[PDB]
C-alpha cells in the first residue's frame, strides 16, 4: 500500500493526549500495516524520528440503531514514540 495510505487519522482522547505529553502519538492505521511499515510512514510524513511503535488491534464494537444492529468497523491503533532530539508532530 502507499505510505500515505498507511496512516489513516490521529486519535484524540484523554489517553492519547496524556501520551502526547510524553511525546508519543496515536494513529489509526490500515489494518494490514505492521509496525515497521507504520514507522516508515510516520517518518516520511512528518520528518520526525521514531523511537518505537506499539501496535494493537481494536475489535469491532457492537452497536444498534432502532431495529437494526451491527458492528463498528475494526480498527488498528498504533502508538508511536518519537526519539528525544526530534521534532514534535503538530496536529
Amino acid at each position: 500500500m502507499e505510505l500515505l495510505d498507511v496512516i489513516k487519522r490521529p486519535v484524540i482522547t484523554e489517553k492519547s493526549m496524556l501520551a502526547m505529553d510524553e511525546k508519543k502519538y496515536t494513529f489509526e492505521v490500515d489494518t494490514r500495516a505492521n509496525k515497521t511499515l507504520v514507522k516508515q510512514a510516520v517518518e516520511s510524513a512528518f520528518d520526525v524520528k521514531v523511537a518505537n511503535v506499539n501496535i494493537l488491534n481494536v475489535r469491532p464494537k457492537f452497536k444498534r440503531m432502532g431495529k437494526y444492529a451491527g458492528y463498528t468497523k475494526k480498527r488498528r491503533k498504533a502508538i508511536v514514540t518519537l526519539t528525544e532530539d526530534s521534532k514534535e508532530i503538530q496536529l
Binding site: 500515505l4 495510505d5 496512516i7 487519522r9 490521529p10 486519535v11 484524540i12 510524513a45 496536529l91
Partner: protein, 59 residues
C-alpha cells in the same frame, strides 16, 4: 479536471497524483480534528486521483 489531466504528461501526472495523495492525507487529519470546513473537498480529491489513474491506464 479530465481535460487538464489529458494535457499533462506521464511524469507530470504521477507527480500530480502524489500531491493529491498528500493533500488527501492532510484532509483526513483535519477532518479527524475539527480543522476541516469544506468536507466535500475530500471526495473531490479522491475523484481527481481516480481520474488520473484512469487516464494513466488508458495511455
Amino acid at each position: 479536471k479530465v481535460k487538464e489531466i489529458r494535457e499533462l504528461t506521464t511524469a507530470e501526472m504521477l507527480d500530480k497524483e502524489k500531491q493529491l495523495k498528500e493533500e488527501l492525507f492532510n484532509l483526513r487529519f483535519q477532518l479527524a480534528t475539527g480543522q476541516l470546513e469544506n468536507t466535500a473537498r475530500i471526495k473531490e480529491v479522491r475523484q481527481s486521483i481516480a481520474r488520473i489513474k484512469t487516464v494513466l491506464r488508458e495511455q
